[PDB]
Amino acid sequence: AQQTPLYEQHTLCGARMVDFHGWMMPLHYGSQIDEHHAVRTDAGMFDVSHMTIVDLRGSRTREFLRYLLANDVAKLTKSGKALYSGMLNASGGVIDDLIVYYFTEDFFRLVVNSATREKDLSWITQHAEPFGIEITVRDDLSMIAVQGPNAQAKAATLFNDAQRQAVEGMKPFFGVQAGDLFIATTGYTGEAGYEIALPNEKAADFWRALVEAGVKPCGLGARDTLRLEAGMNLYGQEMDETISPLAANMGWTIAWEPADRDFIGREALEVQREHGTEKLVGLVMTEKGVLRNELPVRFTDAQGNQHEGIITSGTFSPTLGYSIALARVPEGIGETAIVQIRNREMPVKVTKPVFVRNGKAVA
Template sequence: MEKELKKTPLYEACLKAGGKMVDFHGWLLPVQYESIIAEHKAVREDAGMFDVSHMGQVFFEGKDAYRFLQNAATNNYKLEPGRGAYAHILNENGGIIDDVISFCLSEEKFLVVVNSATREKDFEWFKKKSAGFDVKVTDASDSYAMLALQGPKALDYLEALDADIKLLKRFWIKEIDLFGAKAYVTRTGYTGEDGVEIMGPAEQINKLFAWALEHGFKPCGLGARDVLRLEAGYLLSGSDMDESKNPYEASCGWVVKLNKEEPFTAKEIMARVKAEGVKNKLIGFKLLGAGVAREGCGVYKDGVKIGSLTSATYSPLFKAIGCGYVPAEINDGDKVEIEIRGRMVPAQAVKMPFYKNKV
């Protein structure tokens, strides 16, 4: 018997706005509304919004909340209310369980946003690791809906909702009153453009969706989101990184803070990996010939297969692009070939991100 697909609190609103729904890790989410190219253009030049209510919210409360997260994740968090940081949580071998963003709400309370595909696994891992710490771990995901509002004009439009929105710094969080209820605003993003995510009760986020439609935001789906995040060099959990890869292989060594005092999971292994180097690494590729590569396409050098693409798409800005794991000696600018349906297409290794905006 097939498992019933889950619907976000914004499902009906997305349908009404013209969303074409698909299965994404067990959730029914819009892949597109008008078109992927039109939605990509809206986010790069104006403002778009995405239903990201499938993502998870886990709260950590107690006098050991900060120390626990320092032990649980790779980055070095700051005990400063409002401040957030991106990090990886690792298994005992150094494999990436998930990439998360943690926010300090107070000295004894943190909010961690996790990916939908690993939400349950993350929560169980956090609970197991919390033994011996004075910290309460709560999965509040079912109580929240979440809307991402991104684009160069997003904050201009949002000033009508919150006059102080531009004062929120990158990777910080603040609490607001949203149509009569408490909500959180974060300024991170997954598109390479400026903007915010707003999470709160379903009723309020549905009102926000309707408000945003009337204030310049174009509804956007998973298709445009995948193109935007790959252009910006953001990794997709479960495809570009998983428990078989470590942060250094995923070209995310910067997120591993070996100099912090807390002995986070696999810290000694990460120190060894950094010292010895990696055999394979994630790198970007740009096709030089006709065709559009997809996930799983082989990467070849001098007729020998050296790896496969973990993500690939058509970019309106850069044509056919992708990324994948190949030997560490492959460098930016090296010529390779990518196999597309039995046809070898010339390509070039490119250091990610393909696109970088000043946000």
């Protein structure tokens, strides 16, 4: 595993480093619970520099993306507008989820996860070729996510005047280049904030300024508890190449209309949607204990027949004060289930696959 460029900054901030898909990354800086609290109530930040940023240019870029992705970038009509989308294989399974930004008719940007960098880049370069797209992997850039109710105001203390005017009152899911900073109102936590990409050689200093602006360093531990409360998927757990997006609470991201836009996996997905699929739900365990990944989830229908699903992600929610999980389960589950933890069947509530909105329990 590589030592990441912000390593001295992380260690000055008290990081406990762990191996994370080939990079030593902070698991936390002292207390993952404190770090979760900081993002819910003030401001926390995450080194997301091992996301890969991909710039796509050429007259056929929009057409290409309308084919590659299952959401529809035709919906991006204002400069800087972003959307979340799945990228599917021919059989309708999820290769990755990603964010894409529109800048001009012939300039878009994709951001992809570290774990799936190489698979996605290969998929992307294979399918872009016939469209004659200039494809730029921006490994020259680092990126920091600043999240929480005071994240934007704290970050914006570091912006010059041009930068503040460019993002003033910017709505969620926009990204804008302002000087050497690319500033986007995106995030993986359920809170307001930015993700800010900037040259590698500037990142350590910018992290330092952010700490000084009152933004708490936050590690992977907190990144998982915040994202899971917010009902946001993690590739490889909530979905993978064998799982349909309709079985991963990604139905809302499929842009079915207009009907004449074919995209990779659309045919398979149409079939899937007609057969019907399993569904991703929330689970809440108010009794003592922690739900864990891959545990069986069970329920008995009115007829007395048992059905089985599986936890895709489990954790302790600091905001709710109970364990929560996302779980993929047969259609027809009711309001409760049972999860096998050790050799005891723990009852759980079945809920929508989101636990927190606006720092409050979606109760």
